[PDB]
Symmetry: C3
Subunit: 282 residues, 3 copies
Amino acid sequence: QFHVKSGLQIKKNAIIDDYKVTSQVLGLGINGKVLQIFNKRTQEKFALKMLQDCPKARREVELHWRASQCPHIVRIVDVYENLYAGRKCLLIVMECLDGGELFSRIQDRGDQAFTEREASEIMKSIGEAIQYLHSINIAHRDVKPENLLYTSKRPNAILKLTDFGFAKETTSKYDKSCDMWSLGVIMYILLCGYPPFYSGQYEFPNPEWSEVSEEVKMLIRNLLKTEPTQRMTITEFMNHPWIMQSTKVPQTPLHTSRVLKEDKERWEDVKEEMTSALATMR
Amino acid sequence: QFHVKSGLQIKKNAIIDDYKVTSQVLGLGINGKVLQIFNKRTQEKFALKMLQDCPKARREVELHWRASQCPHIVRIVDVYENLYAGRKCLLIVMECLDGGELFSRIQDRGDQAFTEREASEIMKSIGEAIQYLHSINIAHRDVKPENLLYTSKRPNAILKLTDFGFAKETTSKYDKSCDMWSLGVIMYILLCGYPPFYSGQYEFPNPEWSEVSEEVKMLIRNLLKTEPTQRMTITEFMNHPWIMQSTKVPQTPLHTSRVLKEDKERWEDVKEEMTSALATMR
Amino acid sequence: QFHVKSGLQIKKNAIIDDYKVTSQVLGLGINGKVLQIFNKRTQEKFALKMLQDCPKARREVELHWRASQCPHIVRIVDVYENLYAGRKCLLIVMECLDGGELFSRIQDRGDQAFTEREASEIMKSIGEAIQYLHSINIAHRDVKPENLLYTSKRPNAILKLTDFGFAKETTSKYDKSCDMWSLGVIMYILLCGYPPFYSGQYEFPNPEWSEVSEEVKMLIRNLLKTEPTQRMTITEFMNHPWIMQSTKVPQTPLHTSRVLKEDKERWEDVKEEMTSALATMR
Ligand SMILES: COc1ccc2sc3c(c2c1)NC[C@@H](CN)NC3=O
Ligand SMILES: COc1ccc2sc3c(c2c1)NC[C@@H](CN)NC3=O
Ligand SMILES: COc1ccc2sc3c(c2c1)NC[C@@H](CN)NC3=O
């Protein structure tokens, strides 16, 4: 009848008491690396981000905390303030994710190809995550495809959203629209294997974009509106059939996997271009 | 030889661990309701206010904390920061008070009537509370007669002051005078059954104000000075005989109880008028 | 392979639970006294500073915390926020030091006299302390000779630096140079028994300054540069031989002890003059 979750708690004791810290790096986001780490008690593996600990981070995380309560958002599990170098630091410990960047898992599918229906499901999820955040006044402002990772390597495995180095509180032309834009961008790459390309016209090649119902190409439109306005709100985005169908989407073959294999070098391009497009994007 | 009280402590674990939360509402102050709540361990009843948890509250309470150390001020007992809606919240747990708004207890006295001496004692107490606060640089700025409640329903029961939604630190024409004004207003209503009435002249009717020594009507004056200045300081207020007499005051009958019965509808008027007069009052 | 120290932790429970507080005063620095105090558990003696607890202190200590991890800097051991007077207070508990103000220990040497080599060692240490702080962006801004005290009264005993009422974070003509200046001043008094004297020329009398190698008188120079610039950086200061020699310095007799006995009244002069020179010094 009445339900709360514990507030955020900045543990002061040395993280080394509770965890055994490796040096094996995993992630390499904004500040510092993401080290693998093990829980002495339970003995499971964890992710360790490390922060300077100044007002900024201290709030950035403050949000992640609020965010973790969501499925498709990566869960924070412990937050410590210790003294590293000589520096009031900030170690946030979160569920390690052994799944690889959303896309990096599609180009090792190997067997068969990808599905319009599988694309939905992916997008579908990603949608959710943003919703929640927005639905609590949070703009992620960095929904790149590196920042999406899966829990494990099983195809049942789910993926979550990470790196709040960029999020901001939409408190008290606007803001939480990048998050949409991205989804758009994300969907594109998801279906074909590439984005736009300027600094806006995005064509839809034959060998890829075919009988792919204009209903879909519609979405991508509404989302990509180089406008900040009329960029289909997430609330909106979710409502649109394709998404909330999950399974009522065409089973169409998708070249994307193979496409990605086609020039794995045209990628560290894409990923930077994504950080290019965003980050600055107001 | 050396005496301190524990500092304020923002518990992070779910309040639901330590208390069992009802839904039975009691108070309906500023932010949210005041739910009844029970201590799992001891099993006694408690009051639960709930707050947005932003810098403001976080200090408002910070004061209440300092204030509770007083008898006639309602004691805070636990303060939690949990996550409700999706909202860093702030649950303050305090001694439940089963006594009813100061005045609401006088019009069910039924047996006999009220006493000039009983009025003192009441005022007397209320005085104290303000003192303390002032004596530590705190302006309550909302000493309405709803914000005064008794611990229990026994006539031995004492009353305390509540709702710090309004208090401010008189740190480093002025401020903590409203608190006086109010007392004045409070005394009036206490003796007769009504206040002033404009947006200042306050008459003193026959069937009420009689041989009621001008020494008393004096007080009320000094307090009500539509001035901010020459409004008798509390330090002053306490010194004046009538107050610090408690028992040396005339035993005069007071119609107030009956008066209040006389138009219980002319009341939600009074109470709002009190919030009117105050709140804005600089 | 991976090393951290616990972060700073503001205990909320009454310090009286963990320690038994005396009233025996020891230090009389900036805010309040420094009381002797005993650890109930272990039962050893401790120093207790007490603070108003406002943003300022709360950071001043925040630094001391980071600083204590150093040998020659006095270690903080516990920090409490309790409610004294009626005042959110701040009790910092640190290693008591039974050694007396650096200089106050030299004029009770009695046996023999002081050594150019002993002076080094002293300066040498003091140097270190500053280094660390600087080396983590901290200006002490108050390196007076009262703020240096020894752990015990044994000549093996070491001395440390105290009172961070003045320190500031050199974050993001300048600042952490006073700390140098002082050392200079300190060295002078250390070798002879007096400072400068204006509001700049410092002479070097016969009966004191003799065959005392110009290499030494050089130091003092570079340090005392009434400039803020070309005041020999600490990094620099440490590198200079005399210092990092410890034992390769001449064994020269020093009159300083006797000198100090010579007019112990010309001292509360010196010490204030030191606070004069500093404190304001930008
Ligand atoms: C591997 O398990 C994890 C778990 C959490 C997190 S958070 C995070 C990670 C990362 C990796 N990796 C680096 C980037 C995303 N590429 N940004 C981040 O903050
Ligand atoms: C019933 O036990 C309690 C105990 C504490 C408190 S505080 C508080 C209460 C209230 C009621 N009631 C609502 C108004 C006062 N009318 N404001 C407040 O903050
Ligand atoms: C005796 O054991 C101690 C231990 C720590 C500290 S800190 C401190 C002390 C003092 C004395 N004494 C007063 C002045 C320095 N003279 N300033 C300070 O803050």
